[PDB]
Amino acid sequence: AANDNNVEWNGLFHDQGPLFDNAPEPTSTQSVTLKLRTFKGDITSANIKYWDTADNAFHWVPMVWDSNDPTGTFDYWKGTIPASPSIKYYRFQINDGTSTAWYNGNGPSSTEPNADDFYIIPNFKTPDWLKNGVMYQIFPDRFYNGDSSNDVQTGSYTYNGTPTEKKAWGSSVYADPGYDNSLVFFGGDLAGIDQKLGYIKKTLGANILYLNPIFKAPTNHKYDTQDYMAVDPAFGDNSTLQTLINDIHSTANGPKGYLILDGVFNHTGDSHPWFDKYNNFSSQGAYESQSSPWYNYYTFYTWPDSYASFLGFNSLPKLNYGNSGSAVRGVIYNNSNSVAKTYLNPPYSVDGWRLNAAQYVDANGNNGSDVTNHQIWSEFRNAVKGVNSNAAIIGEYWGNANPWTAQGNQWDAATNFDGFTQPVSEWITGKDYQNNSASISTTQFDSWLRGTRANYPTNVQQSMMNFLSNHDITRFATRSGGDLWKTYLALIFQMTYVGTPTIYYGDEYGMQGGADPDNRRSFDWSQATPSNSAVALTQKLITIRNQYPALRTGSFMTLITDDTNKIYSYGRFDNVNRIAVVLNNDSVSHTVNVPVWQLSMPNGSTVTDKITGHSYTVQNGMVTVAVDGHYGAVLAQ
Ligand SMILES: OC[C@H]1O[C@H](O[C@H]2[C@H](O)[C@@H](O)[C@@H](O[C@H]3[C@H](O)[C@@H](O)[C@@H](OC[C@H]4O[C@H](O[C@H]5[C@H](O)[C@@H](O)[C@H](O)O[C@@H]5CO)[C@H](O)[C@@H](O)[C@@H]4O)O[C@@H]3CO)O[C@@H]2CO)[C@H](O)[C@@H](O)[C@@H]1O
Ligand SMILES: OC[C@H]1O[C@H](O[C@H]2[C@H](O)[C@@H](O)[C@@H](O[C@H]3[C@H](O)[C@@H](O)[C@H](O)O[C@@H]3CO)O[C@@H]2CO)[C@H](O)[C@@H](O)[C@@H]1O
Ligand SMILES: [Ca+2]
Ligand SMILES: [Ca+2]
Ligand SMILES: [Ca+2]
């Protein structure tokens, strides 16, 4: 490069990784020094332009040359944004004589962007254990039956007139004639999860557990809460939970663990005493009397049969949050004995909450996604972080969750359906997560990923829950048509991408399953071993991620987007390691020239493909590697 009235886009780069930002999560008194990469001697000047919410105006910070990279190929320009409590957004203006280019969260541009600027949110922090960990999601009744004495039996009880049905482990989840799909129980419990912590924390290596609802409720999914204060008898008792938590946090069965519970706060079940639609309690619930002490906890359009609920489901009456200080906000998060604080405080001390249907939480029966909804989650954060600043808050949202994360006053992250699950599914399986035909090319995949990462602050990105499948969508192995190699490819991407890799129980061995409830099959333990190829790969990838901080918090740079051969390559790097991932989404092998020079991997240096174990030497800035179809390479040094 040179001063030739032309800014070379390929040499430009910046994100909030270690090499380019010295304060990714600054407090009110910490200044932020940023570095912009360009090819060596390519430009004449660069400036940081940032919007300050403190005064609703743009501010200018001229950059100065700082240094070259070890290969002498690039220059690093530096600039510092002053310290203050205000949220700020920034982009770069890069000049080389008569040539000008812009750069922000969405990469380089000729015209000045008006969206996707990088974020600076003083005092906003997301749990570092969440950024660096691997999550394992468990649907309680379907994981492991550690205590058959608490098993729900066929006819143990009835809900809305229908008796419960017990089914042999491994059998179909579909209820037999006369029974209901939501009242089918296999026996999985908390004791079981406890006895299997070794498999989770050692055989696989995950250190974070996320459980679906475990509080008293008549159904098998239990999102129709009957009593937030009690673990459901089928799963054990509150004492069992205390022990499970202690064993999760313990290091006697593997690395220190963390527990995240599912918080169903938008609604209760219709059998909850506050509502009591079937009169299961002597007390008078809202449905029973307009004089009920909990009458105002819900919203009736025409008492008592027409009331606000989740998506119109009468079994899930929607909670009325009212105004700040209300009784509902009280029992949900403000009170010391609220659902949120009770489990965050000892004797429980869980590590976080996954907020079910978080977008709908509101007052007066409204549908959320409004000022009140955001105000509520703001108060929720103050409540949670006040008890444990290291407790995670992950909201359920299938789209762009920027509104609940970008101001640093609500969630730490969200279920990454839009920035991970969907794009990964359409690129690799040619199906959306509902198993409908929907395919995207490699260039679309890369653009989709970048655009969605840009929706969030960096710490949020690193904390997103990235799962291949979950209890609300079809199994990845089913969308892939049973081709285990597609699962291999997906796992390699998952474990090397930005965000918390999240494994939906069973996905590690290729469990299949269609739409709810077939996506909640009981776990086949004969597959919970390295003998199973997908399990062996999962364990290896988790070891790799744990071995390289660059994969968890390092920078992300696109390297190759080949639509003809379906080759996708990107690099993850920091001050210590440089890793170039090469994914082959084609059905045939391809020999790829990986441009590792972009990550500043020195010519003559060696790299090791952590997948095959083969080593290569960097030559002419490249690493030539033959990658098998529906497989990948993780070239690290
Ligand atoms: O027989 C006719 C009917 O059969 C089939 O559907 C019926 C089901 O088989 C029945 O079990 C019954 O379903 C109701 C549930 O019993 C009741 O608990 C309630 O459940 C709703 C929903 O709750 C959760 O969903 C959460 C999501 O995970 C989350 O993404 C979202 O944000 O929040 C949701 C609420 O917390 C469970 O996970 C999920 O599994 C449950 O579906 O309501 C159910 C619907 O009334 O009745 C069904 C009647 O349709 C069959 O599918 C249907 O076509 C037939 O007409
Ligand atoms: O800022 C004023 C000058 O800016 C421009 O020159 C830049 C170069 O573009 C940049 O590469 C860097 O050059 C240094 C080089 O990287 C390093 O290897 C060498 O040892 O020292 C060089 C100079 O320090 O920094 C200079 C700025 O000093 C612009 O081209 C020039 O006309 C401006 O005067
Ligand atoms: Ca130039
Ligand atoms: Ca049991
Ligand atoms: Ca009653």
UniProtKB/Swiss-Prot annotation:
Ca(2+) 1 binds at A2, D4, N6, D42, D96. Its cofactor is Ca(2+). Binds 3 Ca(2+) ions per subunit. It is an enzyme of class 3 (hydrolase). It holds the Pfam family Alpha-amylase_N. The record marks D472 as: Transition state stabilizer. It catalyses: Hydrolysis of pullulan to panose (6-alpha-D-glucosylmaltose). GO terms for cellular component: extracellular region. It is found in: Secreted. InterPro entries: Glyco_hydro_13_cat_dom (IPR006047), Glyco_hydro_13_lg-like_dom (IPR004185), Glyco_hydro_b (IPR013780), Glycoside_hydrolase_SF (IPR017853), Ig-like_fold (IPR013783), Ig_E-set (IPR014756). Ca(2+) 3 binds at D276, N280, F281, S283, E288. One of its GO terms (molecular function) is neopullulanase activity. The active site is at N356 (nucleophile), E396 (proton donor). Its EC number is 3.2.1.135. GO terms for biological process: carbohydrate metabolic process. Substrate binds at H267, R354, H471, D472, D516, R520. Keywords: Calcium, Carbohydrate metabolism, Chloride, Glycosidase, Hydrolase, Metal-binding, Secreted, Signal. Ca(2+) 2 binds at N145, D147, N150, D151, G187, D189. Endohydrolysis of 1,4-alpha-glucosidic linkages in pullulan to form panose. Also hydrolyzes cyclodextrins. PANTHER family: ALPHA-AMYLASE FAMILY MEMBER, MALTODEXTRIN GLUCOSIDASE. Belongs to the glycosyl hydrolase 13 family. This is Neopullulanase 1. It comes from Thermoactinomyces vulgaris.
